[PDB]
Design a protein around this ligand. Structure first.
Ligand SMILES: [Zn+2]
Length: 88
């Protein structure tokens, strides 16, 4: 109280591709991050749980898109990914 000043305003920055290449990195399936190894994932994940506990509010719209997936039958008893053509 008994004051009158301000100073709260900043910006963010997101950029960094580089020709670098992935190296034994862990591509999380929750935030799409990159960890060194499980040792880090085991902990990193835990974060999600906590973040979900709070984030889990009385939201209104709750839905999730689907991920179509194809497969081959093959006459001869066999099953292989045989990833189809890259639609693009
Ligand atoms: Zn994650």
């Amino acid at each position: 109280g008994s004051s009158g000043s301000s100073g709260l305003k900043r910006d963010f920055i997101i950029l960094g591709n580089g020709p670098r290449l992935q190296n034994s990195t862990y591509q999380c399936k929750h935030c799409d991050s990159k960890l060194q190894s499980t040792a880090e994932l085991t902990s990193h994940l835990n974060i999600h749980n906590e973040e979900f506990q709070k984030r889990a509010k009385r939201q209104e719209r709750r839905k999730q898109l689907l991920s179509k997936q194809k497969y081959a039958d093959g006459a001869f008893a066999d099953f292989k990914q045989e990833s189809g053509p890259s639609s693009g």
